[PDB]
From a paper:
The temperate phage lambda, which infects the bacterium Escherichia coli, belongs to Siphoviridae. The virion of the lambda phage comprises an icosahedral head and a long flexible tail. The tail, which comprises the tail tube and tail tip, connects with the head through the neck. The neck–tail complex comprises a channel formed by stacked 12-fold and hexameric rings and a 3-fold symmetrical tip.
Six copies of the stopper protein gpFII are assembled into a hexameric ring connecting the adaptor. The gpFII structure comprises 4 domains: an N-terminal α-helix (residues 4–24), a β-sandwich (residues 25–41 and 63–107), a β-hairpin (residues 46–62) inserted in the β-sandwich, and a C-terminal loop (residues 108–117). A comparison of our gpFII structure with the NMR structure of gpFII monomer in solution revealed that the structure of gpFII monomer in solution undergoes notable conformational changes to reach the assembled state. The N-terminal loop becomes the α-helix domain. In addition, the stopper ring (gpFII) of the lambda structure exhibits an open conformation. The tail tube connects with the neck via interaction between the ring of the stopper protein gpFII and that of the tail terminal protein gpU. All 131 residues of gpU comprise an antiparallel five-strand β-sheet flanked by 2 α-helices, with an O-shaped loop (O-loop, residues 25–37) inserted between β1 and β2 and an extended-loop (E-loop, residues 45–58) inserted between β2 and β3. To adapt to ring–ring interactions, the long loop (residues 46–62) observed in the structure of gpFII monomer in solution becomes a β-hairpin, which inserts into the inner surface of the gpU ring and interacts with the O-loop of gpU through β-sheet augmentation. The E-loop of gpU provides an attachment site for the major tail protein gpV through electrostatic interactions. The surface of the gpU ring is strongly negatively charged, probably facilitating the correct positioning of the packaged DNA.
Numbering used by the authors:
A (entry chain E), B (entry chain F), C (entry chain A), D (entry chain B), E (entry chain D), F (entry chain C): 1 to 131
G (entry chain K), H (entry chain L), I (entry chain J), J (entry chain G), K (entry chain I), L (entry chain H): 3 to 156
Amino acid sequence: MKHTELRAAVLDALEKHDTGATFFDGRPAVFDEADFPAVAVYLTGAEYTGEELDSDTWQAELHIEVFLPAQVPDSELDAWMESRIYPVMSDIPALSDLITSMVASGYDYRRDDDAGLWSSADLTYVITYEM
Amino acid sequence: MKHTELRAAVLDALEKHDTGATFFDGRPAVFDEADFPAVAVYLTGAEYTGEELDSDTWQAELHIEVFLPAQVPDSELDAWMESRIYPVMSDIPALSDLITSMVASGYDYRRDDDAGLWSSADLTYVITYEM
Amino acid sequence: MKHTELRAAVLDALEKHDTGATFFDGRPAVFDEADFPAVAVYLTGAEYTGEELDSDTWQAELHIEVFLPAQVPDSELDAWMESRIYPVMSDIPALSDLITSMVASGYDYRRDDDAGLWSSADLTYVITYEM
Amino acid sequence: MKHTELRAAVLDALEKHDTGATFFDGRPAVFDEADFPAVAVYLTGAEYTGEELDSDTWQAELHIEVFLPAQVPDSELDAWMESRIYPVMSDIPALSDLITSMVASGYDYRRDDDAGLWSSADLTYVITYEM
Amino acid sequence: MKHTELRAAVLDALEKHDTGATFFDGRPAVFDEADFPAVAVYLTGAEYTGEELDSDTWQAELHIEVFLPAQVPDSELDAWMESRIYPVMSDIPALSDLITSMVASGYDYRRDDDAGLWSSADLTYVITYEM
Amino acid sequence: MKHTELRAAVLDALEKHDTGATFFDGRPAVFDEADFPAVAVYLTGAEYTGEELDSDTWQAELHIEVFLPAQVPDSELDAWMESRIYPVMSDIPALSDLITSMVASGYDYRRDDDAGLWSSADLTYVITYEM
Amino acid sequence: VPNPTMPVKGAGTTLWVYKGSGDPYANPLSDVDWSRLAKVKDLTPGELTAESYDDSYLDDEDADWTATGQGQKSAGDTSFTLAWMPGEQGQQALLAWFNEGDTRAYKIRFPNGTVDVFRGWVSSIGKAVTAKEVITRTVKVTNVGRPSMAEDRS
Amino acid sequence: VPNPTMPVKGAGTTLWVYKGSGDPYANPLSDVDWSRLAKVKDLTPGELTAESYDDSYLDDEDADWTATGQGQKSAGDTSFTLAWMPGEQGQQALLAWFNEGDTRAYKIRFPNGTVDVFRGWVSSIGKAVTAKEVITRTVKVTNVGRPSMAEDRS
Amino acid sequence: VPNPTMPVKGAGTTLWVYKGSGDPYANPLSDVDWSRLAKVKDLTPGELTAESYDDSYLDDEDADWTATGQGQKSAGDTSFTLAWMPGEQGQQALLAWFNEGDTRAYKIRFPNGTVDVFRGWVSSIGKAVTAKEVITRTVKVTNVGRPSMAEDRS
Amino acid sequence: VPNPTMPVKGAGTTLWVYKGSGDPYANPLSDVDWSRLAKVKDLTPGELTAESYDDSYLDDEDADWTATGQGQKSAGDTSFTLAWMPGEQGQQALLAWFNEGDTRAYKIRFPNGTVDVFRGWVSSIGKAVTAKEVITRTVKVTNVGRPSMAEDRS
Amino acid sequence: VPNPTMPVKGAGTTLWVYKGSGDPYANPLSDVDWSRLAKVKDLTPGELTAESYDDSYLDDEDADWTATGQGQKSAGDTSFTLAWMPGEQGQQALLAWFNEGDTRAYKIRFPNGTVDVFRGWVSSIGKAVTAKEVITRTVKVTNVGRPSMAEDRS
Amino acid sequence: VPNPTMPVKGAGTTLWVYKGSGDPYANPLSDVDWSRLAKVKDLTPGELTAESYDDSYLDDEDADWTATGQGQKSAGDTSFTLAWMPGEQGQQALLAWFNEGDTRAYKIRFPNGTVDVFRGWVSSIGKAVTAKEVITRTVKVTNVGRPSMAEDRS
C-alpha cells in the first residue's frame, strides 16, 4: 500500500535483533565517521505492472544498504550481508499483509576510490503490491 | 487535441482540492525558495502512432512534477504522489471528452547533489488522443 | 527528386499564409534576436530504400523547425505546430508530383540552458521519393 | 582485388568530367582554403564475408567525400552531390572487371562548428569483391 | 555458501604449490612495489538464479587476478595463467562440497598507461551454489 | 595451447620473407622514429567455447599490427596489409599442428590525430584451439 | 462515468458465476445471488462462429463463383487464468463444477456498464508452477446453447 | 486530390454497410442509404481465388508437362477489427446481422476515390480484453457470389 | 505461515512417491512411508480435461446453436525434470517403476500447506547432456484413474 | 553493359504481358505488342519441379537401395506484388484476365540481357491495406504447359 | 573424484563402440575390446518411452475417468554429431556399420563413473558444409531390444 | 597440406559434373572429362537414411521391448545454390539435364583430399530475385542407386 508503512514494517522487524547500528528511513541520509555502520531502507523505480484485470498492481524495488568504512575487509561485508540481513528478511509476519509477492535479487559491493570515506553493499528485492 | 485545453483541464481539477501550491502551466517554470511547493504540468514526446485507419491518432506522455526542498525526508514526497495526486488524476470528467485512453506509468524520485537546492518527483502518464 | 525543388515547394506553400517570419532554406541559418521566429526547412539522412525492382527509391526525413526566444511559455510553441505548420503540410498540390509517400512523425521541443537565447521545436516527416 | 587499382579506376572515371577540384587518393589529405573542393576517395571497414564456398569474398565500404567552405548554402551541397557524383558513379566500365557487386547507400551532411572552417558530405557505397 | 569458506578453500589449495607471492583475500588490496607478485581472490556480482523449485540457488563469479609490473613481457603473464593457475583450479577436493557447478570463463589482460605502475590479468569463473 | 608457442610459430614464418622490420613478440612494445616499420603479434580476448563434449575448446583472436609514420599515404598501407602479410598468413605448416581452426577477419586502419606520431593497421584472425 | 457509446479501457473487468435458483437471463444487471471469482490474471471470452452451408444445384445458370449460406452457429470457449487460492469458496465451487458435470451460467461485467452472459460446462482445469512466480489456476469453459450478448439490451 | 493513376496511402479508408431497398451495385458511389462503421483498427479485404481443373486425356501426345485450366472462382473472407462500442447503432446492426442468417452488402471506400463492393454473410464475432488497452471487436465476413471490383468502373 | 486463502509462490514445492502398504488417499498430509525426490529443476502438473458429448436429436425445435454436454473426464500427464543422481535410492526406484509395469501414487506438496495426490504409471525417461551444464533426468508420468485434488479437503 | 557470363544484381527487372496475335516464343526479345506492368514491389518467379517414378521390379537382383526416375515435370507458380493503380490499363487488364478465364503469356526481362517467357492463368488477386503504407495489389499466376527458359537461346 | 550420488557436469563424456566377441552387458566397465569415437561435437541419448493400453470393459461401474495401463516399451533413437575424419578407423567402421545391415552395441561413459549401454542399428548418416566452419558428420542410431541402464549396477 | 585424419575447414569445396563416356566410380580422383560448376553459394549434401523392418512373431517369449531391423536404404537429395549465369556452359548443361530426363553422375571435392561421388537426376530448378542482391539459381538433385562415399577408398 502506502510506502510509509512498508518501510516502517521492515525497519521494525529489522531493529529487534541487536545490531547496534543507526537505521535511516527514506532516501536522505547524512552522517559522518561516528555513526558509521548505518543501514538505510528505501523504495525506488515504481512502475505500473498491469498484470491483473481485477485491480491495480505495481512493481517496486526494495533496497537495504549498509555502509562500512573504506578499507574494511571484504569478508566483513560478506557477513553483514548474509548472516544478519538475509535470515531476518526471509520471513516477516507484518509484510505478508501488504505485499502480494516478494522476490530476492543479488547483492553487490561498491567501494569509494575518489576519497576513500565509505564502502557500502545493498541487497535488492522486487516487490509486487497493490495501490 | 489542443494541448492547451488538455493542460487546462488537468490543472482546473488539480487546483480545486486545497493544496496551497504554486501551479505552473507549461514547460518554462522559474522560482526560488519562497514559493517552493510547485507543481508543473507539461506534455512531452508526441508521436504519430497511426493505430487506426479511420482517423489520425497520436501518443503523448503527460507529466506532473512536484518540487520540494532538498533534504526533505522521502516520506513527504511519497505523500504527494500517493495521497494528493494519484486519487485526483484517476477520474477527471473534463478529460473524458478529449482523451481516448489514458494509462498510468510509474513515478520516480530524483535529488540534486550538484548544489542541493531542489528535490523533485514526477508522475508520468501515457495519453492517446486524436489530432 | 532534386532536394532544391522539394524545399522550394514546401517553402512556397508555407509562405502564402501570413506568418511574418523569416524563412531559411537549408541548414545554414544565422540570425540574432531581431529576426527571431526564423522557420528553417532542411532534409536529412537520405538513404537507399531498395523497395521496388523497377526503379530507384530513397528515404529521407523532412524537417520544419521554428526558433523562439527562451522562457517563452510552452503553450505558444504548441500553437505554431498545431495551428500553423501542421494544417498547411497536410495537403500541398506541389508535393504530390515529386513525393510518392509522406508520413508524419512526432514534433518535439527543446530549450537552451547553456545560455538561454533560443528555444526551438521541429516537426519531422518521412519522405519516400525517386532519384 | 587490390584496393589501389580500384581507387585508381574510380578517380580516373571521376576526373574526365570537368569539375575543377583537387582529388585526394587515399585517407591522408591535408589542405587549406585555396584547395577548397577536395573530393577525397578512400576505402574503409573491410571484412571477410564467407558467402561462397568456391573462393574468397570480402566486403568494404567505398567513400567519396567532398569538402566545401563553412556557411556555404545547403542547396549547393545537394546540387554537387547528386548532379556531379551520382551519374558518374552509376556506370563505370573499369569497375565491372574488379567488383562483383556495388550497392548504393545514403549520403549525409556534416558541418564544423568548433571552428567553422569546413563542411563536407560523403556518399557511401558497399563493395563486394574477391581477394 | 558463506563466501569466507569458499575463498579460504581456494586460497588454501592455491598456496600449497610454491609461488612465492603475496595472496590477498577480498577486494581491499593495498601494496607497493616490494611485494609485487600479488594474487587477489574475490567474488562479485551474486544473483538469485531461481533454477530449482526445491531450494535456493545463486550465481556468482569467482575471480583470480595477479599483478605484475608494467612492461613485463606478455609472455611471462601467459605463463602464470596457463601453467600456474589453470592446473590447480581444475580439481580441488575442498570446493566440491560447497559448489554445485563450476564453469571456466576466459582470462584477459590489462595494462596501466596513465602511470605505468602495474599490469594485471584476471581469470574468471562462474559459480553456482546454495545459500 | 601455450600462447608462446603459437606466437613463436607465427613470427618464425613471418620473418623468413625479407621485410627489414623490427618484430615485437607480445603486447609490450616501445619504439621511436628510428626503428619505425614495426610488426607486433599478440593474442587477446581468450574465452571458453565449450563446443565439444570430448575435450576443452577455446577461442582467441590473433592480431598482426604494423606501425608506420603518420601522413604515410594510404595506398602504401594497403600493400603492407595485402601483399606482405595476407599470403604468408594463409598457410603456415608449423601452425596446423596447434590450431584446429583459423578464420580470417577484416583488417582496419587508424591514424593518430592527437599528436601525429604513428599510424597503424592491424589484421585480425579468430583462432580455435585446445588447452 | 460508464458510457456504452464511447471506447472503453479494458481494466476493471470482473467475472461472476450464477448460484441459486431463477432465470440467468432475467436480469443480468442483478448482483444478488451471484458468486464472484477473485483477481483473474487473464480473460479471453469465446469467439462465436458458424460453418458454411453449400447452396448449389445443377440447374443453376452460372457456377463460376461459389455460393454458401450460414449454417449452424455455436458459442466459443471461454478461457481465463486466476491466482490459486485452494481455501476459497469460489475455487472449490469451480472444482465442484468440473467434477460433477453440470451446465451453469457465468457472467462478465465490463467497466463500460454492459453485462455479458453465457452458459456452458467446464472442459479443462490446469495449474502452473514456477520458481519465482505465483501459482496460478487455468480454466477453460465450453459454452453451450445460445449466449446472451451485451448489446441485446438497449 | 484523389488520383486513380498514382499510388495512394492506406490512411483514411472507411467501411460501410448497405441498408434499404435497391441494387447495391447500381450506384456504389452513393452515400445515401448506407450505414457507416466507426473507428476500424484494422481492415484486410479478402483475396479472390480459384481452383485448378485438370485438362489431360489419354490421347494427348505430350505428357511431360502438366496442363491445367481455371476452375471455380470464389471471393475470399473479409476480416476487420474495430473499437467495441455497444451503444452505437452500427454494432447492434452487426449483431443483428450475425444472429439471424442473412447475406447483406458491404462496401469499402478508399481515399483514392474508387469504391469496392462485396456481398456476404458474417461468420465470426469475437472480443479482446487487456488490462491496458481498448476493448476491441473482431469481425469476419464470408463473401458470396460475384464481387464488384473497384476497376469495373472507368 | 502457510495460508490457503492468500496466494503463494511456487518456491519450495516438493514431490513425493508413495511406497509401502495402505490407502494413499487416507492421510495425504502424512509424511511417513513416503519417499522423496530431491533436486527437482522443473515441475508441470498434469492438466485435467474432458471430451464433448453431442446432445442433439432430430425432434428438437431449434438447431441453430450447437448443444453439447460433458463426456469422459481424464487426468492429464505430469512431467518433471531433475538432476541426474544415479546413486540415490529415489532414481533407482524411478527406473524400477519404469521397467516393470505398475501404477503407483505420487504426491505434490506446495508451500501453501495443501497437498495434491495423483495415481499413474510412468511413460517416458529421458536425459539431457551439455558441455557446460548439469546432466538432467527428464520424466513423464501418465495419470490413471481419478485424482484427489488439493481442495477436496477443507 | 549487360553480360550473361557474369553475376548481376536483380535491380532493374521488368515484367511484361503479351497482348495481340502471334507466337510469344517467336521473338521474346521484342517489346512491340507487349503491355508492361509498372511499379512492381516484389517478384518471385516460379520454381520448376518434377515427381518421382518408382522403377522397381521383383525380378531385380538387389533392392537395398531405392531406384527412382524422373516423372512428370511442371512449371511452378509465379507471384508478384505491385502498387495499387486502378487507373492504369495494365491492372484493368489483369482483372479482365482473372474474371474471364484464359491462359496467356507473361515475360520477365532481367538487366542481364536475357529474357524469360512463361505461359499460364491467374489464380489469386489480393490486396493489403495499412495506415502508413501504400496500398499494394498481390497477384499469383499458375503456369500451364511448357516454359521457354532464358538460356534456351544462345 | 566421481560421485554417483552428486550432480556432475556433462563435460568429458566419451562414446564407444563394441567390436569383438562376447557379451556387451557382462562387463560394461571394461575398456578392452572397445573402439572409441573422437571428439563428439554433440550427443543426445535416446529417450525411453512406452505406449498406453486401454483397460476398459462394459461391466465396469465407473466410467467417468479413463483408465490405461503401460503397453509396449521401446528404447529411443540416439543421435550424435562429430568432426568429419575420413582417415580414422572409427568412422570407416561407422560407414561399414551403415552399409551392411547389423545391430551392434554402443556405450556411453559419463564423468560420473557410471556406464550406459545400448544396442541398435544405424539409421541416418549426413554431413554439414559451411564456408567458415569444420565439416561435421551427423549420425543417428535406432536402438533395439532392452537397454542396460546406468544404475542397474549398484 | 590436406590430411584426412585431421579436422578440415569447409572452405574450398568444389562441385563437378561427369560428362563423356566411362565409369564414374572407376577413378573419382580423376579431373579429366569432368565439367565444373563455378562459384556455388551454398551446398548441403544429401542425408542417407533407412526405414525400419519390423521383426516380431507371436511365438517370441518377450514382447515388452520392440525389435526392428534395417530395411531399404536410400541416398538423400542434394541441394545447392549458385550464381545465375545464363550464358555459361555449365548452367545450360544443368537445364539440358533437367529438361531431358537422365540419371548422370555428380561429384564433390573437399579440400581434405577425399572425393565424394553420387548419381541421380535433378528434381527442382528455382531462381531468386532481390532488389539489391545477386540473382541466384537454386538446384535440387534427387540421388538414385548406391552412392560412392569418400571413405570407401583408403
